[PDB]
């Protein structure tokens, strides 16, 4: 089984990503994403929009189980974090979250 807050440390290692939701959109909007990865508990406007670019833009989406809270911890920041975007998976398999075609 994929760990996931393993692989997004690796990601963070090997990879490239950036966080939020200004940052996701653009990433979006621009075509660097490769996955999203989205807090259960974001605002809902917020996420509505992000699912909304992701689909707009044919970049898949993982429901991220926990809280922003839990998503800022899995990748090391002191703060909520609301969505992921990978730019660059790395030597991780934070792609296999991505699901289904």
């Known amino acids: ?10 990601v963070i290692d090997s ?3 950036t966080l939020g939701y200004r940052k996701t959109v653009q990433s979006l909007k621009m075509g660097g994403s490769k996955l999203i990865i989205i807090a259960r ?9 992000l699912e909304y670019y992701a689909r707009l833009s044919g970049t898949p989406v993982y429901e991220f189980e926990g809280t922003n809270v839990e998503l800022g911890t899995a990748v ?3 703060h909520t974090v609301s969505v992921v975007s990978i730019l660059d998976a790395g030597e991780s398999r934070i792609l296999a979250l991505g699901g289904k075609e």
């Open 1 to 10: 089984m994929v760990d996931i807050a393993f692989e997004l440390r690796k």
């Open 15 to 17: 990879g490239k990503y």
């Open 41 to 49: 508990n974001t605002r809902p406007d917020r996420k509505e929009d």
């Open 76 to 78: 090391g920041k002191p």
